[PDB]
């Protein structure tokens, strides 16, 4: 339906909770390539975690732009799992607001590639890390980036 | 009863400019109630409007028999006669209308010009 | 009371939870047409889901504007049902804020056509999908778009 | 203490939950008139409900301004009662944020004439609809509009 | 039967703005069938339209006795009372109309202003 | 009698564009006098006008049974069938209308285009 061969899509992702994230990052890449996105047009970089991603993604885009490779769409990826503290609730919220603001501030679609789970099993299922539960949502993020980046042109 | 509905129907048709209905509805209403002078005058007005001046006269004359003080009808009757070229009859009908209603200024001027033409 | 025959109203909607949404989308369209909105002036397009709609609606408007068919009002439509994760709470909130901001940013009324339900029965009732409960709220959204788009002129 | 005879105060209000609202709207009007506000300077208009008011109030002001009757203060009025869904929490919040932003964006005081109640009895008491409980808060809103509109000049 | 034709005739006259006919046709139709609440409400509307607010009330009240859930009529009745200066009666009729139909936004604003004036 | 008034009332409603009345008045008139083919055709025209093409057909067919030489009706019937997508039925009704009235130029062009579409 959509052709992503002309798009530059970046992924900026957390290092923390790598098992879940690497499954999510690849899920998105495989689909982007299925839509024709060239592997060389998929930019994958990391940051420590979820506090960095909400602004890290802008800094990431600015660098790619300066280098002559501005992105058409971005999928910051990371996993928040509720712990004993309330960092989860405050990060989930402010992250979401930054990512929504960035849909206009960066000029490109910003895909919420961040999980807001209470348990590990939920985040793991969302990444398709669990064979019997959910699916790898990274794939939808990938597909969405291609559609959002082409649909509205 | 049925005549009232028939008179209301014809009346609406007269107001709306549809004489086929205005005529049939009043004829029906009149068959049910023949003494309605107003309807007879109006029936004459429908025929008058259609250029059917002789018919208009027949109905105007009937209506006047029922109520001869209708100055407007006397005028309208004279007009139907003028349209037929019947100036002598027509001038009397306009003069009677003016005598019944001295404020019929239009009858004054029209009977005056008609008199000039009557000879 | 209001005449919508001169208005262009767009609907951007989620693909996910289609049974509820299609009832909502049509509800709004039927009423818009009852207010005289021409069917050709009702623009209906989709996105995957609720994360796309909060900004997708701007991208949607910009495209319609470039095409010579700017909208007078928009009703993004979608359904959020609380699951086992907290994505519901964070989407509900940020979506609402984006849609409220967009009432000024787009220059047109933006109707909150999004549901924030805890169960399916509640979302289904709101769409009038359940004969014995609520009504199809899509109809109110449709009517509101017509009024908001004409009332303040 | 304050003289409102020179002020234009608008009320934009929800149609929904009219029994409570009409008591609130009149409460404010009676007091505004007690402060000398002329009845002709009190502009009362409606919208369906609480989603419309947060931006509807700007559209309302812009129209009054174009007509040569810009407002000095505004009191959007409406009632939110918690139901089985979370629309209450998200509307309460975004409404509040829009109304606070509008205190600067419109150049005039915006009075939070919106109720955020969990029950009907609470909203009814706040409107003074219940003889034995609270008072008609609409009266305070009216008085506040007069003070805010004069106090800081 | 005759009432239907009389109601159709009056109805056409209401739509066309002719109340002399709309009134007579409905009165005739109602004599033939007195339980037609809609016609009684409409009859009240004809009188209302003519400025005959007390008459409008009489017919609206009859119509409400036959069918009291007609919110629009409750409103129209209150309006006839407001035109007569009967604010207290009138405000109750508008409030009842709103209670029957909460979406009558116009009643909300008009009863609100009327209440200000009622005192 | 009553049918005439009912036909006059419906007729006025047809002319004025009010089909709720035009339909009820003709149905009443027809109950009183079922052989009025013109009224049956007109009844079909009211339904036709409302987009109620199947109903229009029912009445047009009845009217044709009473008087099948009405070329205009044959045409109108074909049109109701075309609106329903019934091209084969519809083309015969237009062709019959043209055979009855060879001067129906509009039927010629419309049946010609319809034939192209019929296949």
Author numbering:
A (entry chain A), C (entry chain A), D (entry chain A): 1 to 153
B (entry chain B), E (entry chain B), F (entry chain B): 1 to 119
Extract from the study:
We sought to develop a general computational method for de novo designing protein nanoparticles with geometries tailored to present antigens of interest, focusing specifically on the prefusion conformations of the trimeric viral glycoproteins HIV-1 Env (BG505 SOSIP), influenza hemagglutinin (H1 HA), and respiratory syncytial virus (RSV) F (DS-Cav1). In the second step, we generated tetrahedral, octahedral, and icosahedral two-component nanoparticles by designing secondary interfaces between a designed trimer (fusion component) and a de novo homo-oligomer (assembly component). This design approach yielded nanoparticles tailored to present 4, 8, or 20 copies of the viral glycoproteins in defined geometries.
Five designs comprising a panel of unique geometric configurations, T33_dn2, T33_dn5, T33_dn10, O43_dn18, and I53_dn5, ran as monodisperse particles of the predicted molecular mass by SEC-MALS and were further investigated by SAXS. The two components of I53_dn5 were re-cloned, expressed, and separately purified (pentameric "I53_dn5A" with His6-tag and trimeric “I53_dn5B”). Nanoparticle assembly appeared to be complete within minutes after equimolar mixing. In order to obtain higher-resolution information, three designs, T33_dn10, O43_dn18, and I53_dn5, representing one nanoparticle from each targeted symmetry (T, O, I), were subjected to cryo-electron microscopy (cryo-EM). The final resolutions of the reconstructed maps for the T33_dn10, O43_dn18, and I53_dn5 nanoparticles were 3.9, 4.5, and 5.3 Å, respectively. Some structural heterogeneity was observed in the cryo-EM data, particularly in the case of I53_dn5. In 2D classification results we generated particle projection averages that range from spherical to ellipsoid shape, indicating some degree of flexibility.
